[PDB]
């Protein structure tokens, strides 16, 4: 699914990711950038402003579980489908999230990677993480029915 050339660029960059805060910045921005997605997270409390969303503790901590889910999906890249089976069922049956929304969280996460890694986040590193998020997203979409 991923060449050793790309696999190196991905894990090379992932190994540097602040695992405590890259996910909460990605989820927070999903809610700032795409305000309608907020209706799925009302249980999270105060989301009335970008500053409130970006400093929200449930947002930050749900973001870490999402990042852990990408992390664990990287460790199973040759069968993403299997690694996202129960999360696909969850997002479908329980959460009623349109998978067309999955694309938006991958793109925001990439943007978060770009924001933090700067000149290190070159076109080639990006293309590979685009490969990853697209495949994570399609795996999360696979078990809709």
């Amino acid at each position: 699914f991923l060449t050793a050339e790309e696999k190196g660029l991905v894990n090379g960059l992932w190994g540097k990711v602040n695992v405590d805060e890259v996910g909460g910045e990605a989820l927070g921005r999903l809610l700032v950038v795409y305000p309608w997605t907020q209706r799925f997270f009302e249980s999270f409390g105060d989301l009335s402003s970008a500053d409130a969303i970006m400093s929200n503790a449930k947002v930050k901590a749900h973001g870490k579980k999402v990042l852990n889910s990408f992390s664990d999906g990287l460790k199973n890249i040759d069968d993403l489908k299997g690694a996202f089976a129960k999360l696909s069922e969850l997002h479908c049956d329980k959460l009623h999230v349109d998978p067309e929304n999955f694309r938006l969280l991958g793109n925001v996460l990439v943007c978060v990677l770009a924001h933090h890694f700067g000149h290190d986040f070159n076109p080639q590193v990006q293309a590979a993480f685009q490969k990853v998020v697209a495949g994570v997203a399609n795996a999360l979409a696979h078990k809709y029915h």
């Binding site: 770009a114 700067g118 076109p123 990006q126």
Partner: protein, 141 residues
């Protein structure tokens, strides 16, 4: 609909970009061709290697029309008229590719202006690029 903060965020981010516009246009394109290979089918007559003069040149033009678009945020349908016809009817670029380019425009600006690329500035830019590419896809059929 862009709000007043959208406009001032877009204009302020664009002022920081400064003379690096065409350079970012050129990088944005290359990232697009690279991360989303199917967009390359629209430039078959192009040399698409990194450094390509031809991509640099087109990069400038795309930069220039987005700059033209920063100054006309209240009537983008007037400012982008010639360009609306070109992409929508002459070239028939599918709307999805615009999302691909807009996204890579975000990455390039996140990469180069990280302090400026706050969650709010991110959203105002997304709102901006989407409005520009809604104009450029309107004239189809």
């Amino acid at each position: 609909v862009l709000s007043a903060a959208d406009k001032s965020n877009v204009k302020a981010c664009w002022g920081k970009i400064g003379s690096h516009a065409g350079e970012y246009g050129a990088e944005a394109l290359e990232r697009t061709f690279c991360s989303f290979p199917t967009t390359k089918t629209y430039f078959p007559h192009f040399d698409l290697s990194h450094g390509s003069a031809q991509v640099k040149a087109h990069g400038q033009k795309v930069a220039d029309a987005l700059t033209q678009a920063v100054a006309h945020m209240d009537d983008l349908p007037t400012a982008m008229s010639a360009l609306s016809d070109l992409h929508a009817y002459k070239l028939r670029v599918d709307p999805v590719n615009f999302k691909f380019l807009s996204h890579c425009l975000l990455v390039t600006l996140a990469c180069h202006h990280p302090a400026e690329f706050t969650p709010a500035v991110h959203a105002s830019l997304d709102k901006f690029f989407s409005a520009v590419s809604t104009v450029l896809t309107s004239k189809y059929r």
